[PDB]
Amino acid sequence: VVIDRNLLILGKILGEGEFGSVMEGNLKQEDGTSLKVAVKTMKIEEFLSEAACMKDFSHPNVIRLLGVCIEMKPMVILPFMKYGDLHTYLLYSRLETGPKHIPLQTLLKFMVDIALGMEYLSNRNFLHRDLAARNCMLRDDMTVCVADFGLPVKWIAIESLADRVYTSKSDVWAFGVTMWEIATRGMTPYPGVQNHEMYDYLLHGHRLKQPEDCLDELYEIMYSCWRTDPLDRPTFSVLRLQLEKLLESLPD
Amino acid sequence: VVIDRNLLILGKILGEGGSVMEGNLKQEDGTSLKVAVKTMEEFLSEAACMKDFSHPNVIRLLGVCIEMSSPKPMVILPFMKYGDLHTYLLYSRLETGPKHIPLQTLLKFMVDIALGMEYLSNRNFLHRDLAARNCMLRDDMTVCVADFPVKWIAIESLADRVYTSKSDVWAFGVTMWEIATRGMTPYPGVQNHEMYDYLLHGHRLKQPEDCLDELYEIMYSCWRTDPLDRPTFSVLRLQLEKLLESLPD
Ligand SMILES: Cn1cc(-c2oc3ncnc(Oc4ccc(NC(=O)c5cn(C)n(-c6ccc(F)cc6)c5=O)cc4)c3c2-c2cccc(N)c2)cn1
Ligand SMILES: Cn1cc(-c2oc3ncnc(Oc4ccc(NC(=O)c5cn(C)n(-c6ccc(F)cc6)c5=O)cc4)c3c2-c2cccc(N)c2)cn1
């Protein structure tokens, strides 16, 4: 999965955190052509066994990992997506000079894309643990792919808040919240509630409120993702068919 | 985007072929701006998508003017005393025009054009007439892409009428060659009618006399026979930016 550092050219920073940075880049490929890539520098064992596991995944709704470079500090190489992240994209759509006003059907498709990507990952028993709109990338064909920047109390399941166990249902809970971000076009979860009040708020039985123009059927699906008992929440494959059927029931 | 005709005063001709004239544009803040006015609902269509663009390397649109004189539409652009890049390059080879352009400045010229093209490529907008003559020099010597030619058309676009963003990349390679050659017409010794045959037999523009091998590599990649093998504007922009940083100041 390793790529020779020679074939990589680094550009300007695209985003910066504290556990690493992400920079644009040029990747020289096998067929001579160059490809625009993103380079997340995570400035190791659990990583080597991970990038190998992820470089073998292949799904259109899962971000594709092009490989890893070794500098003497590892760097992850991913294809550059001009459209950015779904969260920032949603906010832009509420503005006159950005993406056109995203209709209901396009928003639902966004959710379908994510559910497909998560179904694929949960089928291989992979735990994302950081699902959110900010971690979803828009491909060049406007299809959304699941990713994880890695460089969120309101996106964490109730059982994961008190205990520290994470499961496929924890990801499903975060999926419901992501579904709510999309339906709200970028709103922060639980307006009027502080991060420290989140566990108390959830333990008393409170959940995210139904968006303004969100269909009842759509809210039913996302609400199911927040059932107090993880075993009562539906699987990603179940969620994928529910969303796909709802989207089909809507006019083109 | 329309602007009251009474706010525009036309001057002398800056170049013809429609015609472009200098002009004074009274602004909303009371002051007048030195503008360029080009005269010929398909003309308004080109400018429809123009007022949306906002990039320092893309010529900015000031407005559109409909003259009912006797319609006659007119586009208003900011006036650039330094003219077009192609003519500017020729002037550089004369002792009364701008001084000899160093390699770094020539590279920055390409970098500016690449940023402009990258901006419009991300917007899925095809230029289709990219050349040094269609590039304008701003007051701060930065280059901006504009549009006022058989040798600037990609080989896939000569046979068919197909025009992709890779075709713009092909024309970008030719433009890079123009800047490196400081105004030489592409393909010396080759006629316009011989261009398609010339390209079909694997021949490409020749490497300039004082063109660094790295630079020629980048522009050669723009002329690959398969459009899918030509790099994108974003990749090209980084390649030029990296080449420029490696050279001393
Ligand atoms: C106009 N504009 C466009 C972009 C822009 O374009 C981009 N193109 C590509 N990447 C970009 O940033 C990414 C970098 C790395 C990763 N991901 C990894 O490094 C991962 C390693 N693993 C193992 N996984 C994983 C985990 C779990 C799974 F289930 C599946 C995979 C990873 O996701 C994802 C995105 C950007 C940005 C970008 C960069 C910074 C901030 C923002 N806001 C956007 C900025 N501005
Ligand atoms: C000392 N001296 C200075 C100048 C001089 O100064 C100037 N200042 C400003 N403009 C000038 O001429 C222009 C007129 C129109 C346009 N362009 C449009 O009207 C466009 C419509 N569209 C849709 N687009 C488009 C397309 C695709 C995109 F991606 C983006 C935009 C246009 O660009 C561009 C230049 C001149 C000249 C000038 C004028 C004529 C000939 C020459 N040789 C120079 C002469 N002598």
Tokens of A55: 């470089």
Long-range contacts of B195-204 (CB under 8 A, 24+ apart): B195/B150, B195/B151, B195/B158, B196/B155, B196/B158, B196/B159, B199/B155, B199/B158, B200/B155
Nominal resolution in Å?
2.2
Residues contacting residue B38 through CB under 8 Å, at least 6 positions apart: B18, B19, B20, B21, B74, B75, B77, B148
User: Which residues of chain B lie closer than 8 angstroms to A24, CB-CB?
Assistant: 234, 238
**Which residue reads 């556990």 in tokens?**
A19
Write the burial class of residue B67 (CB in 10 Å: 0-12 exposed, 13-18 middle, 19+ buried).
Answer: middle
Residues A91/A79, Cβ–Cβ less than 8 Å:
no
Packed helices A168-183 and A216-224: angle between N→C axes, nearest 10 degrees:
150
* Angle at which helices B103-122 and B165-181 cross, to 10°: 170
**Whose Cα sits closest to atom 2 in ligand 1?**
A84
**Domains within chain B, CATH numbers bracketed:** 5-78 (3.30.200.20), 83-245 (1.10.510.10)
Ligand nearest B84 Cα, by number?
Answer: 2
Do the beta carbons of residue B239 and residue B231 sit within 8 Å?
A: yes
Q: What is the dihedral of CA B241, B242, B243, B244, to 10 degrees?
A: 50
The tokens of A84 are what? 């950015």
- CA A239 and chain centroid, separation: 16
CB under 8 Å to A140, separation ≥6 — which residues?
A81, A82, A83
For residues B107 and B244, is the Cβ–Cβ distance under 8 A? yes
Please state, in angstroms and rounded to a whole number, the distance separating the CA atoms of residues B52 and B55.
10
**Separation CA A155–CA A198 (nearest Å):** 10
Task: Please list every residue in chain A followed by a chain break, i.e. its C lies more than 2.5 Å from the next written N.
Answer: 43, 72, 151
Largest CA distance in chain A: 59
Task: Note whether A36 contacts B234, CB cutoff 8 Å.
Answer: yes
User: Which pair of structure tokens corresponds to residue B204?
Assistant: 């490409």
> How far does Cα B242 stand from its chain's mean position?
22
> Is residue B97 a contact partner of residue B240, using CB atoms and an 8 Å limit?
no
Question: Cβ contacts (< 8 Å) between B241 and chain A: which residues?
Answer: 11
User: Do A63 and A137 meet the contact criterion of CB atoms below 8 Å apart?
Assistant: yes
Encoded amino acid at B68, one letter: M
Phi, psi of B16 (to 5 degrees): -125, 180
The pairs formed by A30-33 with CB atoms below 8 angstroms and a separation of 24 or more are A31/B229, A32/B229, A33/B228, A33/B229, A33/B231
Verify whether the Cβ–Cβ distance B238 to A25 is below 8 Å.
Answer: yes
Token pair belonging to A184? 């709200």
